[PDB]
Each structure stands twice: as C-alpha cells, then as structure tokens.
mmCIF file of C-alpha atoms and ligand atoms in Angstrom:
data_model
loop_
_atom_site.group_PDB
_atom_site.id
_atom_site.type_symbol
_atom_site.label_atom_id
_atom_site.label_comp_id
_atom_site.label_asym_id
_atom_site.label_seq_id
_atom_site.Cartn_x
_atom_site.Cartn_y
_atom_site.Cartn_z
ATOM 1 C CA UNK B 1 -2.199 -38.773 12.015
ATOM 2 C CA UNK B 2 -0.297 -39.810 15.372
ATOM 3 C CA UNK B 3 2.826 -38.143 14.217
ATOM 4 C CA UNK B 4 3.300 -35.147 16.155
ATOM 5 C CA UNK B 5 6.257 -32.843 15.407
ATOM 6 C CA UNK B 6 8.220 -32.134 18.789
ATOM 7 C CA UNK B 7 11.073 -29.287 19.474
ATOM 8 C CA UNK B 8 13.993 -29.376 21.786
ATOM 9 C CA UNK B 9 13.300 -28.077 25.099
ATOM 10 C CA UNK B 10 14.909 -24.417 24.172
ATOM 11 C CA UNK B 11 12.865 -24.040 21.007
ATOM 12 C CA UNK B 12 9.583 -25.456 22.401
ATOM 13 C CA UNK B 13 9.591 -22.838 25.427
ATOM 14 C CA UNK B 14 11.109 -19.735 23.192
ATOM 15 C CA UNK B 15 8.975 -20.531 19.789
ATOM 16 C CA UNK B 16 5.638 -19.129 21.952
ATOM 17 C CA UNK B 17 7.572 -16.015 22.681
ATOM 18 C CA UNK B 18 7.344 -12.966 19.731
ATOM 19 C CA UNK B 19 10.776 -12.769 19.814
ATOM 20 C CA UNK B 20 11.891 -16.028 18.854
ATOM 21 C CA UNK B 21 14.722 -16.308 16.358
ATOM 22 C CA UNK B 22 14.348 -19.504 13.993
ATOM 23 C CA UNK B 23 18.073 -20.283 14.052
ATOM 24 C CA UNK B 24 20.736 -20.838 11.454
ATOM 25 C CA UNK B 25 19.634 -24.498 10.868
ATOM 26 C CA UNK B 26 17.726 -24.180 7.181
ATOM 27 C CA UNK B 27 16.794 -27.986 7.523
ATOM 28 C CA UNK B 28 14.845 -27.283 10.871
ATOM 29 C CA UNK B 29 12.394 -24.262 9.271
ATOM 30 C CA UNK B 30 9.712 -26.932 7.743
ATOM 31 C CA UNK B 31 9.292 -28.513 11.327
ATOM 32 C CA UNK B 32 9.115 -25.416 13.067
ATOM 33 C CA UNK B 33 6.503 -24.208 10.271
ATOM 34 C CA UNK B 34 4.359 -27.455 10.783
ATOM 35 C CA UNK B 35 5.091 -27.829 14.445
ATOM 36 C CA UNK B 36 3.171 -24.242 14.334
ATOM 37 C CA UNK B 37 0.174 -25.536 11.875
ATOM 38 C CA UNK B 38 -0.472 -28.532 14.316
ATOM 39 C CA UNK B 39 -0.875 -26.138 17.449
ATOM 40 C CA UNK B 40 -2.234 -23.288 15.766
ATOM 41 C CA UNK B 41 -4.935 -25.046 13.469
ATOM 42 C CA UNK B 42 -5.077 -28.704 14.888
ATOM 43 C CA UNK B 43 -3.079 -31.963 13.758
ATOM 44 C CA UNK B 44 -5.911 -32.423 11.421
ATOM 45 C CA UNK B 45 -6.148 -29.191 9.522
ATOM 46 C CA UNK B 46 -3.810 -30.668 6.602
ATOM 47 C CA UNK B 47 -2.696 -33.859 5.294
ATOM 48 C CA UNK B 48 1.150 -34.206 6.457
ATOM 49 C CA UNK B 49 2.115 -35.851 2.869
ATOM 50 C CA UNK B 50 0.519 -32.303 1.162
ATOM 51 C CA UNK B 51 1.688 -29.974 3.910
ATOM 52 C CA UNK B 52 5.184 -31.453 3.339
ATOM 53 C CA UNK B 53 5.346 -31.125 -0.484
ATOM 54 C CA UNK B 54 3.451 -27.928 -0.512
ATOM 55 C CA UNK B 55 6.294 -26.425 2.503
ATOM 56 C CA UNK B 56 9.142 -27.768 -0.016
ATOM 57 C CA UNK B 57 7.566 -26.072 -3.336
ATOM 58 C CA UNK B 58 7.203 -23.296 -1.576
ATOM 59 C CA UNK B 59 10.820 -23.273 -0.353
ATOM 60 C CA UNK B 60 12.351 -23.817 -4.020
ATOM 61 C CA UNK B 61 10.183 -20.551 -5.339
ATOM 62 C CA UNK B 62 12.290 -18.465 -2.503
ATOM 63 C CA UNK B 63 15.036 -17.235 -4.136
ATOM 64 C CA UNK B 64 18.896 -16.822 -2.316
ATOM 65 C CA UNK B 65 18.589 -12.896 -2.235
ATOM 66 C CA UNK B 66 19.718 -11.302 1.352
ATOM 67 C CA UNK B 67 16.648 -10.803 2.850
ATOM 68 C CA UNK B 68 13.278 -11.713 0.775
ATOM 69 C CA UNK B 69 14.159 -15.370 1.194
ATOM 70 C CA UNK B 70 12.948 -18.525 2.841
ATOM 71 C CA UNK B 71 14.361 -17.440 6.613
ATOM 72 C CA UNK B 72 11.764 -14.169 6.000
ATOM 73 C CA UNK B 73 8.988 -16.352 4.608
ATOM 74 C CA UNK B 74 8.938 -18.564 8.107
ATOM 75 C CA UNK B 75 9.973 -15.795 10.494
ATOM 76 C CA UNK B 76 6.821 -13.978 9.199
ATOM 77 C CA UNK B 77 5.046 -16.934 10.092
ATOM 78 C CA UNK B 78 6.075 -17.396 13.321
ATOM 79 C CA UNK B 79 5.077 -13.662 13.926
ATOM 80 C CA UNK B 80 1.537 -14.719 13.278
ATOM 81 C CA UNK B 81 1.811 -17.897 14.876
ATOM 82 C CA UNK B 82 2.297 -16.173 18.078
ATOM 83 C CA UNK B 83 -0.219 -13.552 17.715
ATOM 84 C CA UNK B 84 -2.826 -16.147 16.589
ATOM 85 C CA UNK B 85 -1.595 -18.170 19.941
ATOM 86 C CA UNK B 86 -2.162 -14.904 22.241
ATOM 87 C CA UNK B 87 -5.565 -14.209 20.328
ATOM 88 C CA UNK B 88 -7.231 -17.634 20.647
ATOM 89 C CA UNK B 89 -10.933 -17.303 20.251
ATOM 90 C CA UNK B 90 -10.650 -14.129 18.412
ATOM 91 C CA UNK B 91 -9.943 -16.077 14.696
ATOM 92 C CA UNK B 92 -12.021 -19.059 12.583
ATOM 93 C CA UNK B 93 -10.550 -22.289 11.962
ATOM 94 C CA UNK B 94 -10.398 -21.258 8.237
ATOM 95 C CA UNK B 95 -8.454 -17.451 9.282
ATOM 96 C CA UNK B 96 -5.621 -19.819 11.219
ATOM 97 C CA UNK B 97 -4.882 -22.094 8.561
ATOM 98 C CA UNK B 98 -5.447 -19.012 5.893
ATOM 99 C CA UNK B 99 -2.553 -16.698 7.531
ATOM 100 C CA UNK B 100 0.076 -19.001 8.126
ATOM 101 C CA UNK B 101 0.141 -20.334 4.727
ATOM 102 C CA UNK B 102 -0.380 -16.340 3.448
ATOM 103 C CA UNK B 103 2.467 -15.723 5.931
ATOM 104 C CA UNK B 104 4.603 -18.430 4.569
ATOM 105 C CA UNK B 105 4.181 -17.572 0.704
ATOM 106 C CA UNK B 106 3.852 -13.844 1.260
ATOM 107 C CA UNK B 107 7.096 -12.892 -0.715
ATOM 108 C CA UNK B 108 7.166 -15.836 -2.889
ATOM 109 C CA UNK B 109 9.625 -15.553 -5.995
ATOM 110 C CA UNK B 110 10.698 -12.147 -4.704
ATOM 111 C CA UNK B 111 13.871 -10.965 -6.560
ATOM 112 C CA UNK B 112 15.141 -8.456 -4.098
ATOM 113 C CA UNK B 113 14.006 -4.769 -5.655
ATOM 114 C CA UNK B 114 10.596 -2.747 -4.696
ATOM 115 C CA UNK B 115 7.674 -2.371 -6.984
ATOM 116 C CA UNK B 116 8.951 1.301 -7.865
ATOM 117 C CA UNK B 117 12.278 -0.421 -9.114
ATOM 118 C CA UNK B 118 9.973 -2.578 -11.372
ATOM 119 C CA UNK B 119 8.412 0.412 -12.786
ATOM 120 C CA UNK B 120 11.054 2.469 -13.518
ATOM 121 C CA UNK B 121 12.659 -0.832 -15.123
ATOM 122 C CA UNK B 122 9.658 -1.381 -16.920
ATOM 123 C CA UNK B 123 9.540 -5.046 -16.041
ATOM 124 C CA UNK B 124 6.958 -7.497 -17.582
ATOM 125 C CA UNK B 125 5.221 -7.918 -13.928
ATOM 126 C CA UNK B 126 4.666 -3.921 -13.790
ATOM 127 C CA UNK B 127 2.646 -3.880 -17.143
ATOM 128 C CA UNK B 128 0.761 -6.945 -15.935
ATOM 129 C CA UNK B 129 -0.429 -5.504 -12.431
ATOM 130 C CA UNK B 130 0.032 -1.733 -12.323
ATOM 131 C CA UNK B 131 -0.464 -1.769 -8.329
ATOM 132 C CA UNK B 132 0.873 -3.957 -5.412
ATOM 133 C CA UNK B 133 3.056 -5.499 -8.073
ATOM 134 C CA UNK B 134 5.182 -8.146 -6.521
ATOM 135 C CA UNK B 135 2.042 -8.794 -4.016
ATOM 136 C CA UNK B 136 0.143 -9.822 -7.088
ATOM 137 C CA UNK B 137 2.832 -11.791 -8.300
ATOM 138 C CA UNK B 138 3.382 -13.162 -4.948
ATOM 139 C CA UNK B 139 -0.613 -14.462 -4.694
ATOM 140 C CA UNK B 140 -0.757 -15.825 -8.669
ATOM 141 C CA UNK B 141 2.932 -18.173 -6.924
ATOM 142 C CA UNK B 142 0.875 -19.094 -4.439
ATOM 143 C CA UNK B 143 -2.134 -20.292 -6.408
ATOM 144 C CA UNK B 144 0.162 -22.002 -8.777
ATOM 145 C CA UNK B 145 2.033 -23.901 -6.042
ATOM 146 C CA UNK B 146 -1.690 -25.138 -4.683
ATOM 147 C CA UNK B 147 -2.512 -26.593 -8.397
ATOM 148 C CA UNK B 148 0.480 -28.873 -8.526
ATOM 149 C CA UNK B 149 -0.681 -32.511 -8.209
ATOM 150 C CA UNK B 150 -0.319 -33.832 -4.730
ATOM 151 C CA UNK B 151 -0.286 -29.847 -3.236
ATOM 152 C CA UNK B 152 -3.593 -28.618 -2.655
ATOM 153 C CA UNK B 153 -3.661 -28.806 1.537
ATOM 154 C CA UNK B 154 -7.164 -27.187 0.843
ATOM 155 C CA UNK B 155 -8.394 -30.341 -0.539
ATOM 156 C CA UNK B 156 -10.806 -31.562 2.349
ATOM 157 C CA UNK B 157 -12.331 -27.929 2.327
ATOM 158 C CA UNK B 158 -15.891 -27.342 0.852
ATOM 159 C CA UNK B 159 -16.212 -25.521 -2.225
ATOM 160 C CA UNK B 160 -17.136 -22.423 -0.309
ATOM 161 C CA UNK B 161 -14.400 -23.011 2.308
ATOM 162 C CA UNK B 162 -12.166 -23.022 -0.468
ATOM 163 C CA UNK B 163 -13.219 -19.740 -1.990
ATOM 164 C CA UNK B 164 -13.104 -18.096 1.671
ATOM 165 C CA UNK B 165 -9.871 -19.351 2.479
ATOM 166 C CA UNK B 166 -8.001 -18.004 -0.988
ATOM 167 C CA UNK B 167 -9.724 -14.653 -0.631
ATOM 168 C CA UNK B 168 -8.365 -14.622 3.019
ATOM 169 C CA UNK B 169 -4.865 -15.460 1.590
ATOM 170 C CA UNK B 170 -5.103 -12.961 -1.206
ATOM 171 C CA UNK B 171 -6.350 -10.119 0.694
ATOM 172 C CA UNK B 172 -3.637 -11.234 3.262
ATOM 173 C CA UNK B 173 -0.906 -10.795 0.732
ATOM 174 C CA UNK B 174 -1.754 -7.683 -0.956
ATOM 175 C CA UNK B 175 -1.875 -6.276 2.409
ATOM 176 C CA UNK B 176 2.069 -6.864 2.674
ATOM 177 C CA UNK B 177 2.373 -4.109 0.057
ATOM 178 C CA UNK B 178 3.709 -1.515 2.863
ATOM 179 C CA UNK B 179 2.313 1.386 0.458
ATOM 180 C CA UNK B 180 -1.765 0.206 1.489
ATOM 181 C CA UNK B 181 -0.607 -0.133 5.041
ATOM 182 C CA UNK B 182 -0.409 3.765 5.687
ATOM 183 C CA UNK B 183 -4.129 4.468 4.551
ATOM 184 C CA UNK B 184 -5.373 0.873 6.038
ATOM 185 C CA UNK B 185 -3.798 1.491 9.735
ATOM 186 C CA UNK B 186 -5.048 5.517 9.521
ATOM 187 C CA UNK B 187 -8.945 3.851 8.872
ATOM 188 C CA UNK B 188 -8.145 1.482 11.620
ATOM 189 C CA UNK B 189 -6.490 4.306 14.202
ATOM 190 C CA UNK B 190 -10.121 6.372 13.390
ATOM 191 C CA UNK B 191 -12.645 3.416 13.831
ATOM 192 C CA UNK B 192 -10.841 2.270 17.134
ATOM 193 C CA UNK B 193 -10.754 5.799 18.605
ATOM 194 C CA UNK B 194 -14.463 6.248 17.568
ATOM 195 C CA UNK B 195 -15.678 3.049 18.572
ATOM 196 C CA UNK B 196 -17.029 1.850 15.377
ATOM 197 C CA UNK B 197 -14.566 -0.624 15.336
ATOM 198 C CA UNK B 198 -16.596 -4.237 14.771
ATOM 199 C CA UNK B 199 -14.837 -7.661 14.383
ATOM 200 C CA UNK B 200 -18.077 -8.904 13.451
ATOM 201 C CA UNK B 201 -17.860 -6.712 10.238
ATOM 202 C CA UNK B 202 -15.966 -8.724 7.485
ATOM 203 C CA UNK B 203 -14.545 -5.438 6.009
ATOM 204 C CA UNK B 204 -13.384 -4.602 9.604
ATOM 205 C CA UNK B 205 -11.793 -8.137 10.071
ATOM 206 C CA UNK B 206 -10.123 -7.300 6.533
ATOM 207 C CA UNK B 207 -7.885 -4.137 8.104
ATOM 208 C CA UNK B 208 -6.924 -6.197 11.057
ATOM 209 C CA UNK B 209 -5.946 -8.792 9.224
ATOM 210 C CA UNK B 210 -3.952 -6.352 7.153
ATOM 211 C CA UNK B 211 -2.180 -4.857 9.897
ATOM 212 C CA UNK B 212 -1.264 -8.355 11.670
ATOM 213 C CA UNK B 213 -0.127 -9.011 7.823
ATOM 214 C CA UNK B 214 2.533 -5.856 8.061
ATOM 215 C CA UNK B 215 3.059 -6.514 12.106
ATOM 216 C CA UNK B 216 4.386 -9.840 10.942
ATOM 217 C CA UNK B 217 6.205 -8.513 8.049
ATOM 218 C CA UNK B 218 7.849 -5.667 9.839
ATOM 219 C CA UNK B 219 8.955 -8.224 12.977
ATOM 220 C CA UNK B 220 12.558 -8.030 12.108
ATOM 221 C CA UNK B 221 12.267 -4.603 14.541
ATOM 222 C CA UNK B 222 10.695 -6.648 17.321
ATOM 223 C CA UNK B 223 13.709 -9.308 17.796
ATOM 224 C CA UNK B 224 16.353 -8.887 20.302
ATOM 225 C CA UNK B 225 18.982 -6.103 19.455
ATOM 226 C CA UNK B 226 21.521 -8.773 17.773
ATOM 227 C CA UNK B 227 18.869 -10.259 15.881
ATOM 228 C CA UNK B 228 17.611 -6.658 14.560
ATOM 229 C CA UNK B 229 20.903 -5.203 13.935
ATOM 230 C CA UNK B 230 22.245 -8.409 11.711
ATOM 231 C CA UNK B 231 19.030 -8.457 10.082
ATOM 232 C CA UNK B 232 19.024 -4.775 9.070
ATOM 233 C CA UNK B 233 22.838 -5.615 7.163
ATOM 234 C CA UNK B 234 20.473 -8.114 4.874
ATOM 235 C CA UNK B 235 17.824 -5.635 4.477
ATOM 236 C CA UNK B 236 20.368 -2.914 3.605
ATOM 237 C CA UNK B 237 22.041 -5.285 1.117
ATOM 238 C CA UNK B 238 19.099 -5.454 -1.089
ATOM 239 C CA UNK B 239 18.501 -1.822 -0.894
ATOM 240 C CA UNK B 240 22.159 -0.991 -1.647
ATOM 241 C CA UNK B 241 21.704 -3.712 -4.706
ATOM 242 C CA UNK B 242 18.494 -1.876 -5.872
ATOM 243 C CA UNK B 243 20.095 1.608 -5.398
ATOM 244 C CA UNK B 244 23.108 0.266 -7.538
ATOM 245 C CA UNK B 245 20.509 -1.174 -10.173
ATOM 246 C CA UNK B 246 18.453 2.627 -9.989
ATOM 247 C CA UNK B 247 22.021 4.501 -10.908
ATOM 248 C CA UNK B 248 22.469 2.061 -14.078
ATOM 249 C CA UNK B 249 18.951 3.412 -15.048
ATOM 250 C CA UNK B 250 20.298 6.729 -14.738
ATOM 251 C CA UNK B 251 18.273 7.635 -11.596
ATOM 252 C CA UNK B 252 19.876 8.859 -8.214
ATOM 253 C CA UNK B 253 18.361 6.394 -5.793
ATOM 254 C CA UNK B 254 16.574 7.894 -2.420
ATOM 255 C CA UNK B 255 19.615 7.818 0.058
ATOM 256 C CA UNK B 256 18.589 4.655 2.432
ATOM 257 C CA UNK B 257 19.431 2.696 -0.964
ATOM 258 C CA UNK B 258 22.433 4.321 -1.794
ATOM 259 C CA UNK B 259 25.578 2.619 -0.452
ATOM 260 C CA UNK B 260 27.780 6.053 -0.599
ATOM 261 C CA UNK B 261 25.318 6.872 2.353
ATOM 262 C CA UNK B 262 25.820 4.029 5.103
ATOM 263 C CA UNK B 263 26.778 7.164 7.229
ATOM 264 C CA UNK B 264 22.983 7.832 7.094
ATOM 265 C CA UNK B 265 21.713 4.189 7.960
ATOM 266 C CA UNK B 266 21.258 4.531 11.907
ATOM 267 C CA UNK B 267 18.863 8.387 11.179
ATOM 268 C CA UNK B 268 17.126 6.036 8.365
ATOM 269 C CA UNK B 269 16.417 3.553 10.980
ATOM 270 C CA UNK B 270 14.843 6.399 13.371
ATOM 271 C CA UNK B 271 12.554 7.477 10.785
ATOM 272 C CA UNK B 272 11.318 4.119 9.920
ATOM 273 C CA UNK B 273 10.936 2.999 13.328
ATOM 274 C CA UNK B 274 8.703 6.630 14.006
ATOM 275 C CA UNK B 275 7.082 6.861 10.601
ATOM 276 C CA UNK B 276 6.220 2.962 10.241
ATOM 277 C CA UNK B 277 7.155 0.228 12.714
ATOM 278 C CA UNK B 278 5.877 2.342 16.024
ATOM 279 C CA UNK B 279 2.774 3.587 14.751
ATOM 280 C CA UNK B 280 1.875 -0.186 13.094
ATOM 281 C CA UNK B 281 2.492 -1.651 16.483
ATOM 282 C CA UNK B 282 0.653 1.147 18.635
ATOM 283 C CA UNK B 283 -2.387 0.652 16.333
ATOM 284 C CA UNK B 284 -2.333 -3.280 16.790
ATOM 285 C CA UNK B 285 -1.743 -3.292 20.515
ATOM 286 C CA UNK B 286 -4.872 -0.890 21.131
ATOM 287 C CA UNK B 287 -6.977 -3.511 18.827
ATOM 288 C CA UNK B 288 -5.226 -6.742 20.091
ATOM 289 C CA UNK B 289 -4.231 -6.037 23.375
ATOM 290 C CA UNK B 290 -1.992 -9.250 23.844
ATOM 291 C CA UNK B 291 0.448 -8.199 21.083
ATOM 292 C CA UNK B 292 2.023 -5.602 23.479
ATOM 293 C CA UNK B 293 5.402 -7.343 23.469
ATOM 294 C CA UNK B 294 5.651 -6.454 19.903
ATOM 295 C CA UNK B 295 5.333 -2.742 20.478
ATOM 296 C CA UNK B 296 7.727 -3.118 23.911
ATOM 297 C CA UNK B 297 10.257 -4.895 21.879
ATOM 298 C CA UNK B 298 10.030 -2.200 18.942
ATOM 299 C CA UNK B 299 10.319 0.711 21.432
ATOM 300 C CA UNK B 300 13.483 -1.151 22.835
ATOM 301 C CA UNK B 301 15.316 -1.426 19.464
ATOM 302 C CA UNK B 302 14.117 2.155 18.591
ATOM 303 C CA UNK B 303 16.176 3.290 21.846
ATOM 304 C CA UNK B 304 18.731 1.146 20.721
ATOM 305 C CA UNK B 305 19.370 2.959 17.219
ATOM 306 C CA UNK B 306 19.048 6.193 19.104
ATOM 307 C CA UNK B 307 22.261 4.914 21.134
ATOM 308 C CA UNK B 308 24.046 4.426 17.869
ATOM 309 C CA UNK B 309 23.522 7.857 16.699
ATOM 310 C CA UNK B 310 24.809 9.158 20.076
ATOM 311 C CA UNK B 311 27.785 6.809 19.149
ATOM 312 C CA UNK B 312 27.254 4.593 22.610
ATOM 313 C CA UNK B 313 27.478 1.931 20.419
HETATM 314 C C1 JX9 Y 401 11.701 -4.066 6.408
HETATM 315 N N1 JX9 Y 401 11.371 -2.615 5.964
HETATM 316 C C2 JX9 Y 401 12.468 -1.975 6.181
HETATM 317 N N2 JX9 Y 401 12.901 -0.806 5.363
HETATM 318 C C3 JX9 Y 401 13.600 -0.021 6.558
HETATM 319 N N3 JX9 Y 401 14.217 -0.309 7.381
HETATM 320 C C4 JX9 Y 401 13.931 -0.989 8.234
HETATM 321 N N4 JX9 Y 401 14.532 -1.667 9.220
HETATM 322 C C5 JX9 Y 401 13.717 -2.887 9.336
HETATM 323 N N5 JX9 Y 401 12.753 -3.070 8.323
HETATM 324 C C6 JX9 Y 401 12.769 -2.331 7.510
HETATM 325 C C7 JX9 Y 401 11.125 -2.633 4.304
HETATM 326 C C8 JX9 Y 401 11.754 -4.000 3.854
HETATM 327 C C9 JX9 Y 401 11.233 -4.243 2.490
HETATM 328 C C10 JX9 Y 401 9.974 -3.682 2.045
HETATM 329 C C11 JX9 Y 401 9.825 -2.283 2.754
HETATM 330 C C12 JX9 Y 401 9.869 -2.411 4.354
HETATM 331 MG MG1 MG Y 402 6.688 -8.510 0.293
HETATM 332 ZN ZN1 ZN Y 403 7.916 -9.718 3.596
#
C-alpha cells in the first residue's frame, strides 16, 4: 500500500478548487478519481486491485452520450471531493467512502433521456420503477457491478458498515432525481431558518447529503464561463435528441428540448439558474458555509447568461 497516485503540479493545485475541469484526456480520469479517494478517504479505504477493476467496470457501463457520460460521472465525483475536503470534520469515514462512489455511479447506464420520456415512450424501466426511474436503475447498475467477482471494494467493512454504505449510496443516487430536489431544498431552507436543523439527526443528514448530491450533479453551472458554456452545448444536444424523440411519439416537446427554438436558450438558462441552480447553492452555503465558492461561481455564470441576452456576448 506504499503506491500513491500523484498529479502534475497544475492539476495537484487546481484539483482542490471547486471550479476544476478534469481535462479532455479520458485516460487520466481514473487516476484523478483514485487520487481523490486516497486524499478524501485514506490510502487504505479500498484495495487498489479492486478499486481500479471497479472504476473500469463503471466506465464500461457509461454510454457514449453527449452529456450523461463517464466525464459527467468524474466531474460530479470531483465536486463531492471539493465539498468533502472543505468540510473535513462534518462527515464519517463511511460517508466519504460512500458519496464518492455514489457520485461516480450516479448516472450509470444513462441513455440521455429524462424519466418523462421513458413514461411517454412506455419503456420497461418505467413499469419496473414508477418514480425516480433512471435513478433506481443507476443504483441497480451500481449493486450489479459491486457483485462482479473481484469488484467488491467494500469487502473489508463489517456486515453493518456494508448495509450503512449501500443505504448512503442508494439515498445519494435517488436524490439526483431533480423532481425530489425542490421539496428536499424547501425542507432544508425551513429547518435552517427555524433553527431545527440538526446534523446528529440521521433524517436531517440524509436531506443535507441529498442537497450536496444535487449541488455536485448541477456543478457544470459553477465552472469558469468557457467550461459552463461548452458543457451547455452537450446538455442541449441531449435535450434536442429527446425533443426529436418526443415529436416521433406525436408530442410537442417543451421549448427547452425543441431544436427549432435555439433562440430561446439564453432565457431558458436564466429560468434554470433562478428556479434551480441559485436556490440549490444558496441553501447549500447556508448549511455548509465553506461551499460559498459554488454560489459565487454560479452567480457569475448567471451574469454571463444575462450578458448573452443583452447581445454583449
Ligand atoms: C443539468 N441540468 C440542466 N438543465 C438545464 N439547463 C442547464 N444548464 C446547466 N445544467 C442544466 C439538467 C441536466 C439533465 C437532468 C435535469 C437537470
Ligand atoms: Mg441522473
Ligand atoms: Zn448526473
């Protein structure tokens, strides 16, 4: 266990920052992830033979879609790494273990379509799981990979720590269903502003971890403007594929997903930043002050989208 992963100096420095981009080199992404586990968790949390075999099975089971791909998986895992590192003492050894794996696995086997398109398509997954359809599939896919011979990275945990970490991971993945974020955030907003929020309460921890999951999942909006903007093309590339699929079922898609209505994109971003992103990072900063840089960067990118509408860029 005397094998440490190191990064080049620039990555070594920039990886601690929230707005870090993992770069266009796929073959460095697993090392970035292992680097993060070792510093976040310990050089001993996992067996390196098992972890690497787990990481490469997870990579295999992400598809080649414009946005919900292996790059998303590692980007979301880096955001959770930054949160965990700026909030060292607030999380148990197990939560740090669990949440980084949850992040990496949270969009396993994503096809690039919303839960809504599965229902209207009448996809078998919609019949098997009536809500959080893809999120229940992602968790299912994670358990399958953990059960491959040589892949159980949790082996050294007790029976009880094992059940705890799969429960931390299952709640974590379900919480990336953005339909559940609105209620979750409203409740956290309420508990913080009445003073009832209590991190020794497991149901309160669960909601907080869920908000973090949303924050990590939406973290494309917290990067420097050029990363945010170019990630938005990949997001809209999936949205327009889905819109096209909606029209093939004989359903006019909402305008955000209609590729005839690209002109409305900057205004669509305003709504999303105001309705989703800003609220998410406001509440997360109120509960975990050291995550303020996510709010700051999200507000900057809001300002960047406003400048696009005014026609300045
Ligand atoms: C990432 N989410 C976004 N939706 C719309 N505009 C965005 N700009 C950055 N992120 C955006 C969605 C991604 C797919 C699941 C639903 C959330
Ligand atoms: Mg997802
Ligand atoms: Zn995701």
